[PDB]
Amino acid sequence: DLASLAIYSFWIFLAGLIYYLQTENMREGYPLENEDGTPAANQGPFPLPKPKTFILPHGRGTLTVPGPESEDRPIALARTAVSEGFPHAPTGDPMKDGVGPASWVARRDLPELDGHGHNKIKPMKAAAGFHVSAGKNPIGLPVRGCDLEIAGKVVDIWVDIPEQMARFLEVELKDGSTRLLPMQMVKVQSNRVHVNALSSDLFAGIPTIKSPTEVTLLEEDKICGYVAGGLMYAAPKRKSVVAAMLAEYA
Amino acid sequence: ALLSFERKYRVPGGTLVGGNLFDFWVGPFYVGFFGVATFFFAALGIILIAWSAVLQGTWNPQLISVYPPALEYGLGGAPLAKGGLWQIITICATGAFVSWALREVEICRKLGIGYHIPFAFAFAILAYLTLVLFRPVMMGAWGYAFPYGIWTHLDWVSNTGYTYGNFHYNPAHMIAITFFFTNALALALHGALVLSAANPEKGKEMRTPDHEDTFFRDLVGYSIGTLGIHRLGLLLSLSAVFFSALCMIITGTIWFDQWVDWWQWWVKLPWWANIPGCING
Amino acid sequence: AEYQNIFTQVQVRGPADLGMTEDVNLANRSGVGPFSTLLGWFGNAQLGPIYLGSLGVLSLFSGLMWFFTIGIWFWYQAGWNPACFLRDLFFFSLEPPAPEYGLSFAAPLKEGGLWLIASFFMFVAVWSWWGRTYLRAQALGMGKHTAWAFLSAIWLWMVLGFIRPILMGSWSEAVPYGIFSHLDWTNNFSLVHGNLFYNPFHGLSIAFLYGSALLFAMHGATILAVSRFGGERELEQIADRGTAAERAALFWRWTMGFNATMEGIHRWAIWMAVLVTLTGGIGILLSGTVVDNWYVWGQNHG
Ligand code: BCL
Ligand code: BCL
Ligand code: BCL
Ligand SMILES: CC[C@H]1c2cc3[nH]c4c(c3C)C(=O)[C@H](C(=O)OC)c4c3nc(cc4[nH]c(cc(n2)[C@@H]1C)c(C(C)=O)c4C)[C@@H](C)[C@@H]3CCC(=O)OC/C=C(\C)CCC[C@H](C)CCC[C@H](C)CCCC(C)C
Ligand SMILES: CC[C@H]1c2cc3[nH]c4c(c3C)C(=O)[C@H](C(=O)OC)c4c3nc(cc4[nH]c(cc(n2)[C@@H]1C)c(C(C)=O)c4C)[C@@H](C)[C@@H]3CCC(=O)OC/C=C(\C)CCC[C@H](C)CCC[C@H](C)CCCC(C)C
Ligand SMILES: COC(C)(C)C(=O)C/C=C(\C)CC/C=C(\C)CC/C=C(\C)CCCC/C(C)=C/CC[C@H](C)CC/C=C(\C)CCC=C(C)C
Ligand SMILES: CCCCCCCCCCCC[N+](C)(C)[O-]
Ligand SMILES: CCCCCCCCCCCC[N+](C)(C)[O-]
Ligand SMILES: CCCCCCCCCCCC[N+](C)(C)[O-]
Ligand SMILES: CCCCCCCCCCCC[N+](C)(C)[O-]
Ligand SMILES: CCCCCCCCCCCC[N+](C)(C)[O-]
Ligand SMILES: [Fe+3]
Numbered sequence: 001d002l003a004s005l006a007i008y009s010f011w012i013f014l015a016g017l018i019y020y021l022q023t024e025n026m027r028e029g030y031p032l033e034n035e036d037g038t039p040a041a042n043q044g045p046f047p048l049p050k051p052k053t054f055i056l057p058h059g060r061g062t063l064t065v066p067g068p069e070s071e072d073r074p075i076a077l078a079r080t081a082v083s084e085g086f087p088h089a090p091t092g093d094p095m096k097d098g099v100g101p102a103s104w105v106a107r108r109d110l111p112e113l114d115g116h117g118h119n120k121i122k123p124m125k126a127a128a129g130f131h132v133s134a135g136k137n138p139i140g141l142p143v144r145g146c147d148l149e150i151a152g153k154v155v156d157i158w159v160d161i162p163e164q165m166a167r168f169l170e171v172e173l174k175d176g177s178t179r180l181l182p183m184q185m186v187k188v189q190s191n192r193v194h195v196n197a198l199s200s201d202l203f204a205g206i207p208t209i210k211s212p213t214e215v216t217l218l219e220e221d222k223i224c225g226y227v228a229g230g231l232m233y234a235a236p237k238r239k240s241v242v243a244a245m246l247a248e249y250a
Numbered sequence: 251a252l253l254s255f256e257r258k259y260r261v262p263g264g265t266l267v268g269g270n271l272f273d274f275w276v277g278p279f280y281v282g283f284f285g286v287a288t289f290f291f292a293a294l295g296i297i298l299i300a301w302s303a304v305l306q307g308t309w310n311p312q313l314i315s316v317y318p319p320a321l322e323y324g325l326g327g328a329p330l331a332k333g334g335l336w337q338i339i340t341i342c343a344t345g346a347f348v349s350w351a352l353r354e355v356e357i358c359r360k361l362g363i364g365y366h367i368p369f370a371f372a373f374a375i376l377a378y379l380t381l382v383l384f385r386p387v388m389m390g391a392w393g394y395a396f397p398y399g400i401w402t403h404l405d406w407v408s409n410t411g412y413t414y415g416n417f418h419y420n421p422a423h424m425i426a427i428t429f430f431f432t433n434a435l436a437l438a439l440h441g442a443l444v445l446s447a448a449n450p451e452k453g454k455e456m457r458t459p460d461h462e463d464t465f466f467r468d469l470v471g472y473s474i475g476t477l478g479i480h481r482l483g484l485l486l487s488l489s490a491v492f493f494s495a496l497c498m499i500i501t502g503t504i505w506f507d508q509w510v511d512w513w514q515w516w517v518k519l520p521w522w523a524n525i526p527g528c529i530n531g
Numbered sequence: 532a533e534y535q536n537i538f539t540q541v542q543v544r545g546p547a548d549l550g551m552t553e554d555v556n557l558a559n560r561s562g563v564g565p566f567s568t569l570l571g572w573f574g575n576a577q578l579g580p581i582y583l584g585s586l587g588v589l590s591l592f593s594g595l596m597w598f599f600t601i602g603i604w605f606w607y608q609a610g611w612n613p614a615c616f617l618r619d620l621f622f623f624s625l626e627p628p629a630p631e632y633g634l635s636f637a638a639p640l641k642e643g644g645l646w647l648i649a650s651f652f653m654f655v656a657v658w659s660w661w662g663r664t665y666l667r668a669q670a671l672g673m674g675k676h677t678a679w680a681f682l683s684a685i686w687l688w689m690v691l692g693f694i695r696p697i698l699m700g701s702w703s704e705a706v707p708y709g710i711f712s713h714l715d716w717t718n719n720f721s722l723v724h725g726n727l728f729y730n731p732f733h734g735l736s737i738a739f740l741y742g743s744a745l746l747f748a749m750h751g752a753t754i755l756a757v758s759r760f761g762g763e764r765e766l767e768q769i770a771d772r773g774t775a776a777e778r779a780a781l782f783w784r785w786t787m788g789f790n791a792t793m794e795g796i797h798r799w800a801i802w803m804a805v806l807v808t809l810t811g812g813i814g815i816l817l818s819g820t821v822v823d824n825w826y827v828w829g830q831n832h833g
Contacts, residue, residue, distance in 0.1 A: 002821050004832050006813060007731045017802065025795035028772055029253030029780065040251035054448070056770055057455040063770055069254035077258060085275045087262040100261030101362025105774045112767050115460035115551045124543070133544035133576070134568045159543050162460045163475060164577065166541050167761075184759040187532060188540040196533050217767070221774050224760045228362035232263050253784065255777050280785035357785050361778045364535065364759065366752035373748075404728050418714040434743040434804045438683070441800030442676035448769050448794055449674045459766060461671050463575070464550035468667045471564070471581035477763045478574025481537060484751035487744040513711075517618060527610030528619045 023049045027065040035084050058117045060110070072106040075099060095226060095233050096205060102229025104221035111214045114162040119214050121167055123156045126213045130159050136188050143171045143181070143193045145200035146230075146238040148247050152179075152203060154193060158215070168215070168223075169193065171203070179206040180215065185227045197230040199237035251277070264360035266352065280360075284353035288346050295342030299398070302335040315399030321391045328392075339398065340382055347375045370484060373491045380495035388503045414501060415508035422497035423509075429490035436486055440479050536758050542571045549580065555670040559584055582667060590659040597652035601625045601708045604645050624709030625649060628702045638702075649708055650692065661685060680805050687808040690816050698820050725824030732814025733825075739806040746803045750796055753779050768793045 023046050030048055032040040054063045076097035077088040090099055098104045112120040124130045132139075138154045145151045151171065155178060158168035168180040187194045198206075207222035209215050215223075239247075252260075262273055267283040274281055303314045319333020328334045354368040382395040396406040411417040418424070443465065447457035459476050466473035474482060505512070517523060517530045525531050534540065547563035564579030605623040609616035616623075628635070628643030638644040665678040696704040706716050721727035728734075754762050762768065762775035776793040783790040791799060822828045 001832060003817050003828065006817065010732075010735070010810070010813070021795065021798055021802065022789070024798055025791040027795070028776070028792045029255060031254075032251035033254050033257075035252060035257060037257075042251070054770055055453075055455045057458065071255060071258070075258045077261065080262075085277075087270075087273060088257060088260050089262055094261065099258050100263070101259075101360065103258050103362075103774050103777075105255070105772060105777060107771045107773055112764070113458075115458045127545065130543055130545040132541060133566070134542035134571060135540055138541060157541070157543065159545070161545065162458070162548065163463070164543060164545055164548070164575065165475070165477070165539070166543050182759050183540075184534060184536050186540075187534050217771060217773070220761055225362075225774050228759055231362055232359065253777075253780065255772075256781060256784075259778070259781055275785070278784045278788040278790075354782075354786055357782055358756065361782055362759075363778050363782065364752075364756035366535070366755045367749065367782065370748045370752045374745075408726070408728060416714065416718050418718065419711075430740055430744060433747055434740055434807050435684075437743045437747045437800055438680040438804035439677065440747075441797040441802075441804070442680045444765055444794075444797045445801060446668055446674035446676040447766055448797075449676075450672045451669070451674065454672045456766065456770060457671070457673055458551075459764065460548075461551050461553075461673060462766075463548070464555075465667055465671055465673060465677075467550055467580060468555070468560070468582035468670075469664060471561075471579050472570075472575070474574035476765065477536070477758065480751040480754040480758075480763055481573060482751075483747035484755065487748035487751065490744055513621065523614075523618055525612070525615045525618060527612055528608065528615040529622055530615075530619045 019046070022046050027052070029069065030066060033069075035079060035088070057115075058113055060108075073098075073104075095202065095229050098222065098225055098229075100229065101232050102225050104218075104225035107217040107221050109216045109218040111216050118161070120162060121158055121160050121215055122213060123158050123170060125156055127159050127161055130161070130164075132157070136190065138169060138188045138193050141188075141191070141193050143169070143186075143195060143203075145198050145203065146196050146234060147199040147201070148239050148244065149200035150192075151195070151198070151200040173203060175204070177208070178212075179203065179208065180223050181206075182224050182227055185224075195227075196238070197227045197234065199230070199234045201237070202230055202234060259361060261360070264356055264358075266356055266359075280353070280357055282353055282356045284349040284356065287349040288353060291342045291345035291349060295339045295346065298335055298339050298342070302330075302339075305331055305335075312400050315397050315402040317397045317402075318386075318392045318395045321393040323393065324391055325387060333392065336395075336398065337392065340395075344375075344379070344383075347371075347378070351375065366484070370488060373488045377491045377495045380499055384495075385498055385501075385503070388499070394502070410501075414506075415510050417509055419509040419513055420497050420501065421512060422493050422500065426490055426493035426497055429486055429493060433483070433486040433490055436479070436483055440483065443479075536755050538572050542568065542576060544576065548577065551671060553671050555582070584663065584666065586659050586663045586666065590656050590663060593652045593659070594656035597649050597656055600645060600649040600652060621710040622712075624707045624712035626707045626709075626712070627696075627705045630701045630703040632703075633701050634697060643702065646705075646708070647702065650705075654693070657685065657688065676801065680801055683805040683808045683812075687812040687815070690812040695816055695818075695820065698816075704819075720818070724818045724822070725826040725828070727814075727818075727825060729825035729829045730814045730818065730822075731829070732810045732817070736807055736811040736814060739803060739810060743804045743807060746800060749783075750800065753782065756782070765793050765797075 026046060026048055031043055034040050048066050051064050051066060056062065076091045077099055078091045080086050080089050090097060094100050095102050114120050139156060141154050142150045143152045143154060152173045153171065154169050155172045156170040157166050158170060158180060159165065160167050166183045168183060169186055170178050171181050172178045181195060185195065185197050187196070206226055207219065209219050260275070262270055265273055265282055272282050272286060279285070299314065299316060302316045303309065306314065308314065316336045316339055317333065318336045319328030323333060327337060351368045351371050354371065355365065358365050358367070386392050386394040396403050443462050447462050450457055463473040463475065523531065544566060549563060560582050561580040563577065566576045567578060568576060570576050604625050606616055608623050609619060625646055626643060627646045628638035632638050632643070636647060638647060661678060661681055664681055665675055668675055668677060692705045696702050706713050757775040757779050760773060760775035760778065762779065768776040780790040780792070
């Protein structure tokens, strides 16, 4: 019966497609390793795919995936248990060491570029013609940590030029040096900017940028990993929800 | 085993309940307190689905069906064989889904990421509770909930739809469908745009988000952007399921006639739109 | 509280972006349009520019003529009375030839001749629009994934209105151009073919339609969960894996035991959505042509 033929054929078709799709999604991370770095024995019923290469614009190289996988950074962790499957405890300060939810990835130490070979992200003072066009302008506002103290003041916005959107706040510290705060990790209020992820005292430890008009991909992973990591590691110093609600009327 | 970059993320912390008493993995899976809870609920519910399957006779998985208690049983409990097993399974299933959401919450907390994923899952759970809890309780009987069979739950849809005529005229059903279609439309476009930039004509360089905007600006005159597309996708998916749960929380509660009869409002509105010559007057 | 990245807090605006050039013939791009502050709360604020080629204009022309052919006939049914044409807008219907004409193009204008005219206009609107989504991507050096996906929707639309009616023998098999009438058509079709719920391709199609909602919900929320790590710059995370992409994979790995890549999630995405109309078209095509009662059919087979 032809309908039987058709539905039968589609299920043989569907099985092959799931095979193709699952091996396609194995171009990163694989082959699986053991908790010590060495190849793992049982790799699953799927073989790695035939490699593929991306040509990156602005003569930045190529990328072939899957290729050999190396973290290429210090991982300040230590194995807690004997058998596999248990946590790996930090050996030091995990915020400063950038492990766990403070993690970062050893990306290229160059900025991302738009379709013209220019830095994708710049401060507004150095991005020609960019201004705040709706919403509360946060420049000048004081910047408050989750312990409810003031950590600095907004001195500029860093903008994604081709996409016309805000990506970082530039926050001056007491020492007069600045830092970048991820736009998705800040609440912009009528009279302050509130940062739930960081107690006022961890702002100084935000990793810094080497050039005050560009930010490199590696710098972005360090800054964002750190801020995100304060959620778990700064919890001792995070005042309560009612404590914050009350702070309004102070 | 681990992905080649996994180890640096497998630190302690993030739990909601139990400290580190369950802070470990099994293979790729994280367990935590709610992996235990999920296992308890689903295994119990599966055990009872088997028990209800032997009371029925068959082992064919297309024939097993756990029915809700009859209508005359109102909102009270029923014996296991006559609806009671359905009622415990509904509790376990609910316990499994809720624990599953909270396990994701633990996983988010370890990884330092937003809580958007469990939040979006709650929309699916709430849609399920609309069909088996909120609507039946509002109608007076568990027997209004759907049964648990691969084909009987389908026959429930058909019987329930045709009870109020053509369900298409349900205006909230109309909206829900519009969201399901626009979601599929947007999903296809969003996978295609990223793939077409990551994989240009053979021998060319990877494209940039600038090309993605230009493609859509050229094609339709607007591009929502790389962040807006992900927000839109979530909102479309969640709006579809929201207007789905709404279209039934009103069906047999705030309205009980043929659903075609709703669209005679503007036609036969008290302004007596006599306006003859057409089919409506 | 905590920012969720659902709505932009602060909008920024620069000099108007005319876009990437590549091999686009810039003689055909409009100027930049205005900015919308409302749109910039959710997505981009800039409107335009748009490209207007030969194909785009031909498409908008036939698209209007199709629309205007239903519009002329709807005014007609309303007794040419404006107040009536508004109250019955959803009940008007431009309907295909009666079954006895078969595939003849001899239908009188008021008995499905105007339906054959509107269809020709839509046939040319859609197919020239498809050509425009190949050409726009070609002009930019991009892949043709969009136009290949748009082929899946065209498949189901061609099955309902062109391919099945011919195999069956009449234009009456096709769909009416009416807001409520095409819902009525959908219902009768299921009844006449023995409960479309028992068409195993209608079953697959629904699974994929639910799955598209499922999949975009996971992926949109996943990307939003990691926008704090630049996660929505997916192209650069494909070329240079960031902690965004790694935490996303690991959320799913720790949750369901497997996981994707920042590029292959989009392969799942394209195929989830495209199998909806691919299975759906097959299901409809086999109805009345190969199977007359899906329920009775399925009791015999399997
Ligand atoms: C003859 C039948 C009637 C009709 C009567 C009905 C009836 C009756 C109903 C709908 C409902 C729906 N209809 Mg209608 N409808 C008809 C024709 C259509 C057509 C069409 C093209 O003709 C379409 C597109 C739709 C569209 C839809 C949707 C709006 C909606 C279904 C999705 C939903 O809400 O999911 C919501 C999602 C869920 C409920 C999923 C929940 C998942 C849970 C949280 C988790 C499960 C986990 C699982 C157990 C894990 C398993 C193990 C793992 C896999 C390992 N209908 C005809 C005219 N319609 C339904 C609705 O609105 O429901 C609220 C509904 O009940
Ligand atoms: C949502 C609105 C309606 C409804 C209307 C329809 C219609 C109409 C159809 C289905 C179909 C299906 N429905 Mg139903 N269905 C509803 C409620 C549910 C619930 C639930 C707990 O709320 C579940 C789990 C299911 C499950 C399913 C699958 C058997 C099937 C494919 C759907 C799919 O891929 O979705 C998206 C989900 C995924 C892609 C993820 C994978 C989930 C897998 C497939 C679930 C397997 C469930 C298993 C067999 C039973 C529970 C197993 C436990 C381990 C004990 N339905 C309500 C009442 N459903 C289709 C079908 O073919 O039915 C025979 C079909 O045509
Ligand atoms: C009583 C009614 C019947 C029924 C009868 C049918 C029939 C009949 C059909 C479906 C179809 C579908 N049904 Mg069913 N179905 C019922 C019950 C359901 C239920 C449910 C919960 O009860 C659900 C969820 C579904 C689900 C579905 C979908 C999976 C599927 C349509 C996919 C789609 O996106 O099409 C939407 C997408 C398109 C139509 C493609 C459009 C492409 C063209 C090119 C667009 C052109 C645009 C034009 C130019 C306009 C321009 C406008 C301007 C630019 C602004 N059915 C019951 C049993 N169902 C279809 C299918 O595939 O069946 C196998 C179908 O034909
Ligand atoms: C809100 C929009 C969409 C959505 C969202 C959504 N669903 C999600 C997620 C999100 C964001 C998850 O994070 C979560 C997940 O982890 O997915 C991989 C999930 C998920 N969505 C699922 C299913 C699902 N979602 C659906 C739909 C959608 N989900 C919406 C369209 C549908 C349908 C029919 O449309 C289904 C079938 C699972 C794949 C998964 C959650 C897995 C889970 O909760 O596991 C714990 C429980 C078990 C392993 C088994 C419990 C078994 C019971 C005790 C017995 C069975 C009871 C059941 C009532 C029987 C039903 C019989 C059927 C024939 C009716
Ligand atoms: C894979 C399955 C999904 C899919 C895919 C899909 N559709 C697609 C694409 C893809 C991948 C495209 O490339 C293409 C596109 O360009 O999208 C942006 C398209 C698209 N899918 C569309 C529609 C569509 N897709 C649908 C469905 C689906 N599309 C599936 C869910 C549906 C339904 C029924 O669910 C519809 C209606 C179009 C928006 C577009 C194709 C456009 C086209 O061919 O247009 C020709 C017609 C014209 C150019 C103009 C006609 C005139 C107007 C009708 C006039 C009326 C205007 C009124 C007077 C104005 C009122 C204004 C108010 C503000 C007052
Ligand atoms: C003020 O009013 C004016 C006059 C300005 C207007 O213009 C108002 C306009 C309107 C009110 C228009 C209203 C329009 C609608 C409600 C249309 C709604 C449409 C649908 C619901 C679409 C139904 C689905 C249609 C399908 C599935 C069509 C497939 C058809 C294919 C085109 C088939 C292929 C081609 C064929 C058969 C043509 C063959 C002829 C040849 C010469 C080859
Ligand atoms: C219905 C969609 C099916 C989803 C399952 C697809 C493959 C799951 C198994 C992935 C294997 C994980 N592994 C071993 C490669 O790491
Ligand atoms: C998806 C919505 C589509 C909206 C279409 C927007 C097109 C705007 C075209 C901009 C025209 C600007 N200008 C100066 C030429 O008029
Ligand atoms: C789907 C497109 C919808 C775009 C409309 C956006 C609605 C406006 C919401 C305003 C939010 C402004 N605010 C104060 C929260 O920042
Ligand atoms: C077909 C839809 C339902 C599929 C059920 C879930 C598939 C199993 C995928 C989980 C993979 C876990 N594993 C083995 C890789 O560790
Ligand atoms: C590309 C994604 C693949 C996901 C596979 C989903 C398969 C759903 C199976 C549902 C069963 C429907 N049927 C035909 C038995 O009625
Ligand atoms: Fe994406």
